Amino acid sequence: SLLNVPAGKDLPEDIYVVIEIPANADPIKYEIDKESGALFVDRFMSTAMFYPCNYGYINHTLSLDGDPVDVLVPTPYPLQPGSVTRCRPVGVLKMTDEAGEDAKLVAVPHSKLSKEYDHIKDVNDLPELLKAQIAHFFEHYKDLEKGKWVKVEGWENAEAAKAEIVASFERAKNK
Amino acid sequence: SLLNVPAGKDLPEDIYVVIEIPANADPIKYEIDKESGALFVDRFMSTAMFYPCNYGYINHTLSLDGDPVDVLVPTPYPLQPGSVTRCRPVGVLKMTDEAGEDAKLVAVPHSKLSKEYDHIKDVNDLPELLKAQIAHFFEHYKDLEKGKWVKVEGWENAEAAKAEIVASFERAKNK
Amino acid sequence: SLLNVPAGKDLPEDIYVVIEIPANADPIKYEIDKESGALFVDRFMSTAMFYPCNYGYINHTLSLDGDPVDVLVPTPYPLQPGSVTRCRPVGVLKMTDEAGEDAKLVAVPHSKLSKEYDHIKDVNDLPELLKAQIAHFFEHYKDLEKGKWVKVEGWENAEAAKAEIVASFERAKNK
Amino acid sequence: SLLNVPAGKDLPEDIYVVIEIPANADPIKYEIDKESGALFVDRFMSTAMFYPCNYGYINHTLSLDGDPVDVLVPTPYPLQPGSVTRCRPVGVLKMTDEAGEDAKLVAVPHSKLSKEYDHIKDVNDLPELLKAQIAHFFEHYKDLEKGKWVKVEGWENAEAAKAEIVASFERAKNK
Amino acid sequence: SLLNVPAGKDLPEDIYVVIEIPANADPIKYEIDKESGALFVDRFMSTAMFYPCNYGYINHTLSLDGDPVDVLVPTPYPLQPGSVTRCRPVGVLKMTDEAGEDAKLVAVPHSKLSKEYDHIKDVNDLPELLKAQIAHFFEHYKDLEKGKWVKVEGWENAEAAKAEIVASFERAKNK
Amino acid sequence: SLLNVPAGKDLPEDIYVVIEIPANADPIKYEIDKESGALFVDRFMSTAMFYPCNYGYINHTLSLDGDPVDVLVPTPYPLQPGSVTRCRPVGVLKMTDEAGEDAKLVAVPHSKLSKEYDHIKDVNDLPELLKAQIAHFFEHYKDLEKGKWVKVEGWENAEAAKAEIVASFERAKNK
Ligand SMILES: [Mg+2]
Ligand SMILES: [Mg+2]
Ligand SMILES: [Mg+2]
Ligand SMILES: [Mg+2]
Ligand SMILES: [Mg+2]
Ligand SMILES: [Mg+2]
Ligand SMILES: [Mg+2]
Ligand SMILES: [Mg+2]
Ligand SMILES: [Mg+2]
Ligand SMILES: [Mg+2]
Ligand SMILES: [Mg+2]
Ligand SMILES: [Mg+2]
Ligand SMILES: [Mg+2]
């Protein structure tokens, strides 16, 4: 099932990301249930906004906010919910919210899946417009939700992203 | 697995519905197989009709017609086949066909998912139009099938829908 | 799980196909992982081409290329990745590629799902345009992938398709 | 503009149909305004039904119901509203409603646009299932509309369809 | 042409809105060009936001900001760019930006198109959620543009929306 | 009408492209009719291929094949048939077919519509995958159409594209 997908073939450089929410989709926040491994609806978003990239997580990790590391994955076409994509991390958006530090990594499709992203090696290589749209989405998508708040802190590089992956894999194995 | 989802967190007021067919989708009737948990195509509908709401069932229940309780769930955007939604029952369409009594519950998204449906408490709070569209769909969607027949008896209120969930949950323990 | 779907209710005339790629979809090649049962992204296709029918495999078979038998299934509307369809084989497109025989079966929805395909009994009953489109898709969709190539050899009849199903079932059963 | 499209290159065998409503679309009835030539919304349908084929009309015709001849056009993929498709008539569904005799012709794409339909020469050549779904749609799509009623009378052949085209072209030119 | 559509059949209670951007669509801002009547791309939006309702204007009007009156129209399914819908005004969101006063009217489909919106007579009958989503969209959709700024002032009632339509219709006569 | 859209605000650097076929759409080839200005269906393509970018033409130009200059325009989301986009030429794919030279320009959205394409100044700035996909599409999409064929000759730079625009404008102006 989805509960037994590996964190990656070779962490933290070569990872698997379990997709929860397709890029450019309707505003429904899905999450994979840790118990059943099924796709649950978490929320129908109240702002008229959509996740800008496919969104999911790395299995067998535990971040500082209490859940698996969250990852955004840009692709040429949107992926299915519940699919597993091989990726390489290039960057991270740091932000805090009610859950604690809730970082969003960015990882692009591995060169075996496509050579389209081979030229993206670090956070400075992502399009400026994509980075701005991602930050603006996390700054505002919860603006109409009652008990919730976000502060976006800013972008860090691929080395920062990989260290969060190592740390969160270490934390799950112990914890 | 989808076979391991709970009936609900606090039945019968707070339930989980496993979605089989999205609202406003192509006329493919899917059903979750009890053996595998996999989504099986049951039928390509011959009428040019679509389910007016998302359609699914409550896991770990056994209605009078031999299957899990069937539920319609209105949402602001259509859900994925195989996803699980937390809901509150608000009424039931009673109908008979060749499985016997084949009532269709209506449940709305739980207030944790959306504020949109908080003001819907009972069957008289559903829009008249949506009730008429649901009854008309179930009256006509198997018109070009066989020896199927449907007789719609009418709407009952939330207290009756809750009785059907408890009876069918307690029923399935036993069998 | 998808892993425990049967090959068929009555091989070789009545089989189950596990769908990986919907008809007329974006050009993403999904595969079901044999260990986890999850949907993995295999490749983002570089050609501007789409599978002309839903594409999947018969579980618990082992074909001459080392993988379950591959099957195309025409339907009136596209199926979800991960779904299972009951089908009847009508024909096979023999082709070789870069490690070996890699035939593609064609199978139509079973008469219990729809009467639409009842008149298609054999490969001569498939529309000619459809067969030309399938063979053109397989001839060209890996054209931009450097180490890959495809030789299409031609269409054979349902008797040939059914022989392959039984032989491939026995190969998996006995290994 | 759309107001100056010809009825056809060679009536009644070779016609143009102006598409108003795409096949397999949401339940919105559009109509081309005779004054402005713009696409107007005529109705949001209240049943959960969808037109089974692309729907439109032949320009410069005037049927017995007071409007241009209505035509259904099956295609491999849905057409855009406001597009013009070259067709050959193969059949007609006769029905009466509040407007009078309101026949719905069926015409398939001309062989210059595709050879897919070249084998459809008359009403008996259309799939049985398509004809049944078309009749059932016109029998029921107005069931929830207040001041409206339909009686479906039945199918007639291509010669009947072409005579309605000749008659309605004659009636417009005079009237 | 779309340039020849009337402002309305009985202004200001009964109007026509020409639709430019569908509800819940990709973030392409279209506008009808006054010269040609053609649909022109005005902008690819940089935010990951979508218009929460269909968006368009009333033809043959001239508001204080130099353009036709702008109108949001909620519908049960999204409309086509360039289509024309008969509506009734129910309120107005007052806001200023760099065109000056750039109010956005809300109008619902006329009762001849749908019974769904009959019970909405004035601005307090719109769902609170939908009003909040509209205000939040207009507050944030140009966040990543330039020297644009928006200040939302608040909702006024149907009597004020009707005054703005008459003033702008009578205005455009003159100029 | 579409017929009176200008070639450009400042040829050849700043042009308007009238879109006929959206990116990533079903395989229907639309063309704008030069007499009526309507969208006509030209062909249902028999290959399982899609245009890899939006496709259209510059109005009031006359290229060496007797038709307005053809243009592909990459956008972040697909455009509506019949829409007009302001663009800047970056390159041209020279090709011959069965009556003559039939070059295809590539032009990107103008910086007033989006900053995304500002860094694409010339043909060497287009992603290599994209150029390979375009050339592969034009090499193969008429493969099943008996009297048609295509020889791709290669990519030339923006200076070559702009020469063709001006020459083709002068040809239409002077004929
Ligand atoms: Mg969207
Ligand atoms: Mg997460
Ligand atoms: Mg987190
Ligand atoms: Mg059921
Ligand atoms: Mg039941
Ligand atoms: Mg496609
Ligand atoms: Mg194989
Ligand atoms: Mg539909
Ligand atoms: Mg008509
Ligand atoms: Mg009529
Ligand atoms: Mg405006
Ligand atoms: Mg304005
Ligand atoms: Mg040309």
Domains of chain D plus CATH, in order, are 1-175 (3.90.80.10)
Backbone angles phi, psi at F101, to 5 degrees: -65, 135
Q: Find out whether A17 and A5 touch, Cβ atoms under 8 Å.
A: no
Q: Which ligand has an atom closest to residue E72 CA?
A: 11
The angle at the Cα of E38, spanning D73 to E161, to the nearest 5 degrees, equals: 100
The one-letter code for the residue type at C98 is E
Residue B110, CB-side half-sphere exposure with 13 Å CA sphere: 20
- Closest partner CB to D116 (pick from C24, C115, C129): C129
Burial E39-66 (b: 16+ CB within 10 A, else e): bbbbbbbbbbbbbbbbbbbbbbbbbebe
Tokens representing residue E78 in the block: 């999204």
Query: What b/e sequence results for D81-96 when a residue is b if at least 16 CB atoms lie within 10 Å of its CB, and e otherwise?
Result: bbbbbbbbbbbbbbbb
User: Quick check: F127 contacting A, CB < 8 Å?
Assistant: yes
Question: At a CB cut-off of 8 Å and minimum separation 6, what does B146 contact?
Answer: none
Q: Looking only at Cα atoms, what is the longest distance across chain A?
A: 43
Q: Are F126 and F91 within 8 A, CB to CB?
A: yes
- The tally of CA atoms less than 13 A away on the side-chain side of residue E172 is 18
Phi, psi of B101 (to 5 degrees): -85, 120
What lies within 8 Å, CB to CB, of B167 at 6+ separation is: none
Local structure of residue F131 (DSSP, 8 states):
H
Which helix (DSSP H) or strand (DSSP E) does residue E139 occupy? helix E128-140
CA atoms of C48 and A122, how far apart (whole Å): 29
Would you say B89 and B169 are in contact if contact means Cβ atoms under 8 Å apart?
no
Q: F100 in the Ramachandran plot: left (φ > 0), alpha (ψ -120 to 50) or beta?
A: left
Q: Which are the residues after which chain C is interrupted (C to N > 2.5 Å)? A: none
Residue E77 in 3-state DSSP? coil
CA atoms within 13 A on the CB side of F73: 34
Partners of F49 on chain D (C-beta within 8 Å) are: none
Q: What is the DSSP string of chain A?
A: -GGG--S-SBTTTBEEEEEEE-TT--SEEEEE-TTT--EEEEEE-SSSB--SSEEEE-TT---TTSSPPEEEE--SSPPPTTEEEEEEEEEEEEEEETTEE--EEEEEE-TTT-STTTT--SGGGS-HHHHHHHHHHHHHTTTT-TT--EEEEEEEEHHHHHHHHHHHHHHHHH-
Please name the residues in contact with B67: beta carbons below 8 A apart, sequence gap of 6 or more.
B57, B99
Tokens of A170: 């270490």
Q: What is the resolution of this structure in A?
A: 1.9
* F37 in reach of chain E (CB within 8 A): no
**Which residues, in sequence order, are bridge partners of residue D68?**
none
Largest CA distance in chain E: 43
Please give the method by which this entry was determined: X-ray
Contact A166, A63 (CB under 8 A): no
How far from F6 is each of E43, F19, F108, CA to CA, in Å?
Answer: 19, 14, 18
DSSP-derived letter for residue F123 is G
What lies within 8 Å, CB to CB, of C128 at 6+ separation is none
Sequence-separated (6 or more) residues with CB below 8 Å from residue C7: C15, C16, C58, C59, C60, C61, C165, C169
Burial class of residue E139, CB neighbours in 10 A (0-12, 13-18, 19+): middle
Give the ligand whose atoms come closest to the C-alpha of residue B58.
Answer: 4
Cβ atoms of residues E60 and E6 within 8 Å: yes
SS3 D35: coil
Cβ–Cβ gap B4/A35 under 8 Å: yes
Query: CA nearest A21: which of A94, A91, A61, A71?
Result: A71
Give the Å distances, CA to CA, from A44 to A40, A48, B55, B114, E129: 12, 11, 17, 6, 12
- Are B109 and B103 in contact, with CB atoms under 8 Å apart? no
What region does D62 belong to: left with phi over 0, alpha with psi -120 to 50, or beta? beta
Closest CA of chain C from B127, distance in Å: 31
Do F and B touch, 3+ Cβ pairs within 8 Å? The answer is no
E58: left (phi over 0), alpha (psi -120 to 50) or beta: beta
Question: Are residues E17 and E6 in contact, defined by beta-carbon separation less than 8 angstroms?
Answer: no
Instruction: Please check whether residue D46 touches B, CB under 8 A.
Output: yes
